[PDB]
Amino acid sequence: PLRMGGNGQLQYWPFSSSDLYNWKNNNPSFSEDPGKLTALIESVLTTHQPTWDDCQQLLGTLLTGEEKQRVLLEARKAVRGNDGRPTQLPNEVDAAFPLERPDWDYTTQRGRNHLVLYRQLLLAGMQNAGRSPTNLAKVKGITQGPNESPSAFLERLKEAYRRYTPYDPEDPGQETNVSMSFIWQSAPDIGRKLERLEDLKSKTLGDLVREAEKIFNKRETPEEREERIRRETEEK
Amino acid sequence: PLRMGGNGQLQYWPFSSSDLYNWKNNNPSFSEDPGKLTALIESVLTTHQPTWDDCQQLLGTLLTGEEKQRVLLEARKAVRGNDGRPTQLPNEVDAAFPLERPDWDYTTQRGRNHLVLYRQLLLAGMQNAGRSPTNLAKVKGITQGPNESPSAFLERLKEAYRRYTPYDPEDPGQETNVSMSFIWQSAPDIGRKLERLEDLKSKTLGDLVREAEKIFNKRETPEEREERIRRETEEK
Amino acid sequence: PLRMGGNGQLQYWPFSSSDLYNWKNNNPSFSEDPGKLTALIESVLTTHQPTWDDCQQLLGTLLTGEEKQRVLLEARKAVRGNDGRPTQLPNEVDAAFPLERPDWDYTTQRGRNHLVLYRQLLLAGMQNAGRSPTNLAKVKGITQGPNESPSAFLERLKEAYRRYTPYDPEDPGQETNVSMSFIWQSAPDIGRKLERLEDLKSKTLGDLVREAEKIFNKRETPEEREERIRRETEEK
Amino acid sequence: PLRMGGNGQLQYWPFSSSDLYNWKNNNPSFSEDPGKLTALIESVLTTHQPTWDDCQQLLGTLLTGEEKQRVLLEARKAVRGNDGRPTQLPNEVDAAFPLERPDWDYTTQRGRNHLVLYRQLLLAGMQNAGRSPTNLAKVKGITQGPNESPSAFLERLKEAYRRYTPYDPEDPGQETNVSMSFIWQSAPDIGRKLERLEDLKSKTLGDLVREAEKIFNKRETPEEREERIRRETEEK
Amino acid sequence: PLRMGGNGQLQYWPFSSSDLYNWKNNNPSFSEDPGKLTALIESVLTTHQPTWDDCQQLLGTLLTGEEKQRVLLEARKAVRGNDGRPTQLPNEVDAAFPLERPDWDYTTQRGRNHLVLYRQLLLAGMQNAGRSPTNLAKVKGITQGPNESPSAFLERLKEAYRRYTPYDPEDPGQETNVSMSFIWQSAPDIGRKLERLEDLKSKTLGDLVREAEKIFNKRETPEEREERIRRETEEK
Query: DSSP letters of A71-91?
Result: HHHHHHTT-B-TTSSB---HH
Residue C82 distance to chain B (closest CA, Å): 31
* One-letter-per-residue 3-state SS of chain D: CEEECCCCCEEECCCCHHHHHHHHHCCCCCCCCHHHHHHHHHHHHHHCCCCHHHHHHHHHHHCCHHHHHHHHHHHHCCCECCCCCECCCHHHHHHHCCCCCCCCCCCCHHHHHHHHHHHHHHHHHHHHHHCCCCCHHHHHCCCCCCCCCHHHHHHHHHHHHHHHCCCCCCCHHHHHHHHHHHHHHCCHHHHHHHHCCCCHHHCCHHHHHHHHHHHHCCCCCHHHHHHHHHCCCCCC
Beta bridge partners of residue D4, listed in sequence order: D10
* One-letter-per-residue 3-state SS of D48-88: CCCCHHHHHHHHHHHCCHHHHHHHHHHHHCCCECCCCCECC
Q: Do A17 and D7 count as a contact with CB atoms less than 8 A apart?
A: no
- The 3-state DSSP class for residue C3 equals strand
Q: Are strands E10-12 and B10-12 parallel, antiparallel or unpaired?
A: unpaired
Is D14:D3 a contact under the CB 8 Å cutoff? no
Is B144:B174 a contact under the CB 8 Å cutoff? no
Q: Do D5 and E6 count as a contact with CB atoms less than 8 A apart?
A: yes
Is C129:C34 a contact under the CB 8 Å cutoff? yes
The helix (H) or strand (E) run that includes residue C4 is strand C2-4
- Ramachandran class of D114: left when φ > 0, alpha when ψ lies in -120 to 50, beta otherwise: alpha
- What is the four-CA torsion angle of A143, A145, A149, A152, rounded to 10 degrees? -50
D151 vs A contacts (CB less than 8 Å)? 29, 31, 64, 66-67
Is B235:C153 a contact under the CB 8 Å cutoff? no
- The 3-state DSSP class for residue A49 equals coil
Q: Do B224 and C137 count as a contact with CB atoms less than 8 A apart?
A: yes
Beta bridge partners of residue B80, listed in sequence order: B86
> Hey, which chains touch D, using 3+ CB pairs under 8 Å?
A, E
- Which runs of consecutive H residues, i.e. helices, occur in A186-221? 188-195, 205-216
The b/e string for B201-219 (b: 16+ C-beta within 10 A; e otherwise) is: eebebeebbbbbbebbbee
Is B13:A47 a contact under the CB 8 Å cutoff? no
Q: Do E133 and C48 count as a contact with CB atoms less than 8 A apart?
A: no
Beta bridge partners of residue E11, listed in sequence order: E3
Q: Give CA–CA dist A69/A67, Å, rounded.
A: 5
Q: Residue C18 carries which side chain, given as an amino acid letter?
A: S
Is A105:A111 a contact under the CB 8 Å cutoff? yes
Is D52:D38 a contact under the CB 8 Å cutoff? no
List the single residue in A18, A133, A141 with the smallest CB-CB distance to D22.
A18
Beta bridge partners of residue E86, listed in sequence order: E80
Surface-to-core class of residue C205, CB atoms within 10 Å of its CB (0-12 exposed, 13-18 middle, 19+ buried): buried
Is A211:A194 a contact under the CB 8 Å cutoff? yes
- The 3-state DSSP class for residue C12 equals strand
Q: How many CB atoms lie within 10 A of CB A7?
A: 15
Give the residue from E42, E24, E33 showing the smallest Cα distance to E124. Answer: E42
Q: How many CB atoms lie within 10 A of CB A211?
A: 18
Surface-to-core class of residue B24, CB atoms within 10 Å of its CB (0-12 exposed, 13-18 middle, 19+ buried): middle
A9 vs D contacts (CB less than 8 Å)? 6
Q: Identify from C2, C25, C47 which residue to disrupt to test chain E contact, counting E C-beta atoms within 10 A and taking the largest count.
A: C47
Residue C222 distance to chain E (closest CA, Å): 11
Task: List, in sequence order, every beta strand (DSSP E) within chain A.
Answer: 2-4, 10-12
Q: Give CA–CA dist C114/C118, Å, rounded.
A: 6
Q: Do D66 and E149 count as a contact with CB atoms less than 8 A apart?
A: no
Give the residue from D38, D80, D89, D76 showing the smallest Cα distance to D59. Answer: D38
Surface-to-core class of residue C54, CB atoms within 10 Å of its CB (0-12 exposed, 13-18 middle, 19+ buried): buried
Which residues of A have a CB under 8 Å from any CB of B? Answer: 1, 3-7, 16, 18-19, 22-23, 26, 43-44, 46-48, 149, 151-152, 154-155, 158, 169-170, 205-206, 209, 213-214, 217, 221, 223-224
Cα angle vertex B214, ends B211, B218, to 5°?
150
Q: Give CA–CA dist B108/B96, Å, rounded.
A: 16
Cα angle vertex C50, ends C45, C56, to 5°?
100
Residues 6+ apart with CB under 8 A from D63: D30, D37, D71
Cα angle vertex A147, ends A144, A152, to 5°?
55
Q: Give CA–CA dist B10/A223, Å, rounded.
A: 56
Q: Give CA–CA dist C114/C111, Å, rounded.
A: 5
Residues 6+ apart with CB under 8 A from C234: none
The helix (H) or strand (E) run that includes residue B4 is strand B2-4
C-alpha D37: how far from chain center: 6
Q: Are strands C10-12 and B10-12 parallel, antiparallel or unpaired?
A: unpaired
Q: Are strands D2-4 and D10-12 parallel, antiparallel or unpaired?
A: antiparallel
Q: Give CA–CA dist B24/C35, Å, rounded.
A: 30
Chain D nearest-CA residue for E220: D137
- Crossing angle for the helix pair B150-164 and B205-216, nearest 10 degrees? 140
Q: Are strands C10-12 and C2-4 parallel, antiparallel or unpaired?
A: antiparallel
Is A6:B9 a contact under the CB 8 Å cutoff? yes
Is E38:E130 a contact under the CB 8 Å cutoff? yes
Q: How many CA atoms lie within 13 A of B108 on its CB side?
A: 6
> Hey, which chains touch E, using 3+ CB pairs under 8 Å?
C, D
What long-range pairs does A7-12 form, CB within 8 A, spacing at least 24?
Answer: A7/B7, A7/D6, A7/D7, A9/A107, A9/D6, A10/A49, A10/A106, A10/A107, A11/D3, A11/D4, A11/D5, A11/D6, A12/A51, A12/A106, A12/D3, A12/D4
Q: What is the DSSP letter of E102?
A: -
- The 3-state DSSP class for residue A117 equals helix
Cα angle vertex B62, ends B58, B63, to 5°?
110
- Ramachandran class of D203: left when φ > 0, alpha when ψ lies in -120 to 50, beta otherwise: beta
Q: Give CA–CA dist B32/B160, Å, rounded.
A: 11
Surface-to-core class of residue E110, CB atoms within 10 Å of its CB (0-12 exposed, 13-18 middle, 19+ buried): exposed
Q: Give CA–CA dist B72/B78, Å, rounded.
A: 10
Q: Give CA–CA dist B102/B104, Å, rounded.
A: 6
The b/e string for B149-182 (b: 16+ C-beta within 10 A; e otherwise) is: bbbbbbbebbbbbbbbbeeebeeeebbeebbebb
Q: Give CA–CA dist E71/E125, Å, rounded.
A: 5
The b/e string for D118-127 (b: 16+ C-beta within 10 A; e otherwise) is: bbebbbbbbb
- What is the four-CA torsion angle of D182, D183, D184, D190, rounded to 10 degrees? 120
Q: What is the DSSP letter of C178?
A: H
Q: Give CA–CA dist C166/B215, Å, rounded.
A: 20
Give the residue from E199, E201, E196 showing the smallest Cα distance to E176. Answer: E201
Beta bridge partners of residue E3, listed in sequence order: E11
C19 vs E contacts (CB less than 8 Å)? 16-18
Is E16:E23 a contact under the CB 8 Å cutoff? no
CB pairs under 8 A between D and E: 65
Cα angle vertex B4, ends E53, A115, to 5°?
105
Experimental method: cryo-EM
The helix (H) or strand (E) run that includes residue E2 is strand E2-4
Q: Identify from B15, B31, B143 which residue to disrupt to test chain A contact, counting A C-beta atoms within 10 A and taking the largest count.
A: B31
Q: What is the DSSP letter of B85?
A: S
Q: Give CA–CA dist C183/C186, Å, rounded.
A: 5
- Which runs of consecutive H residues, i.e. helices, occur in chain C? 17-25, 34-47, 52-62, 65-76, 90-96, 109-130, 136-140, 150-164, 175-185, 188-195, 205-216, 222-230
Q: What is the DSSP letter of C9?
A: S
Q: Give CA–CA dist B233/C221, Å, rounded.
A: 41
Q: Identify from A42, A43, A156 which residue to disrupt to test chain B contact, counting B C-beta atoms within 10 A and taking the largest count.
A: A43
List the single residue in D57, D67, D70 with the smallest CB-CB distance to E43.
D57
- What is the four-CA torsion angle of C182, C185, C189, C190, rounded to 10 degrees? -10
Beta bridge partners of residue E10, listed in sequence order: E4
Q: How many CB atoms lie within 10 A of CB D178?
A: 21
Is E51:E2 a contact under the CB 8 Å cutoff? yes
Beta bridge partners of residue A3, listed in sequence order: A11
Q: Do B66 and A16 count as a contact with CB atoms less than 8 A apart?
A: no
CB pairs under 8 A between A and B: 65
- The 3-state DSSP class for residue A228 equals helix
